[PDB]
Structure 1
Amino acid sequence: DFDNLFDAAIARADETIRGYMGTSATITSGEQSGAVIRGVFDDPENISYAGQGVRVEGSSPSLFVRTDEVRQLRRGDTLTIGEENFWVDRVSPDDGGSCHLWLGRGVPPAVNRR
């Protein structure tokens, strides 16, 4: 399927890690609307300080989704990790078999495009 001999192996490994390490994300809104993906989600912890002390500690979630099922995903649409509601911010370019989905939290802020 690919002039690769290698990307086939990385795709098989990608499926393996998704099956063994991941969660059943369900998506609402957007062109995909109701759909289910198997993506491994993590929530690294990041803090900003702003003024004197204005600590706004939060998290920066990621999903590591496979590109084929998440094409034309756009950015404004939301997402649901089980019982929790997120929203995609940006989509990383494909590394060969998948991409990192960078996730927000809560309602996406407006559109502000016109």
Structure 2
Amino acid sequence: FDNLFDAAIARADETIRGYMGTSATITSGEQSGAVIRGVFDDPENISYAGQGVRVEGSSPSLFVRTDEVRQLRRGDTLTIGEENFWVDRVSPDDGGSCHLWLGRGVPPAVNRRR
């Protein structure tokens, strides 16, 4: 590691993930069968669509080490416990770990014409 601080924070993040981690398995993607640990967070948000239409839901996310997620790409599908999630956006590398913003549906159809 470049500095003392980088190694220290790597060990600290590893301990955090060990003590507060949930096992998640990727299903469809380049890492077809990897198993990854992370901290699972499911906060709440509600937005209104008009006069009365209220849409109630949640925005889950996952906190994983960036070394085992290098091959991961947007649109992949992974499972935690019983329910299934897909990867929405992968946060930039902070320290030694990065977030996996997730969605609870099936992946959307793609628009790109490549």
TM-score bucket of the superposed structures, by smaller chain: over 0.9
The whole-number CA distance in structure 2 between the counterparts of 1:88 and 1:7 is: 27
Partner secondary structure for residue 11 of structure 2: helix
Q: CA RMSD in A?
A: 1.0
Q: 1:3: Cα distance to partner? A: 1.5
State the TM-score, normalizing by the size of structure 1: 0.95
Moved beyond 3 Å, runs of 4+: none
Per-residue CA distance 1:47-106 (angstroms, 9 max, x = gap): 010111111110100111110000121101111012110000000001011001100012
The whole-number CA distance in structure 2 between the counterparts of 1:41 and 1:57 is: 20
Q: 1:108: Cα distance to partner? A: 0.7
The whole-number CA distance in structure 1 between the counterparts of 2:2 and 2:13 is: 18
Q: Which residue of 2 aligns with 1:79?
A: 78
Structure number having the greater strand percentage? 2
**Contact 1:89 1:103 survives alignment (8 Å):** yes
Per-residue CA distance 1:18-74 (angstroms, 9 max, x = gap): 000010011100000111011110101000101111111101001111100001211
Count of matched residue pairs: 113
Q: Which residue of 2 aligns with 1:44?
A: 43
Unmatched 5+ residue regions in structure 1?
none
Unmatched 5+ residue regions in structure 2?
none
Partner secondary structure for residue 36 of structure 2: strand
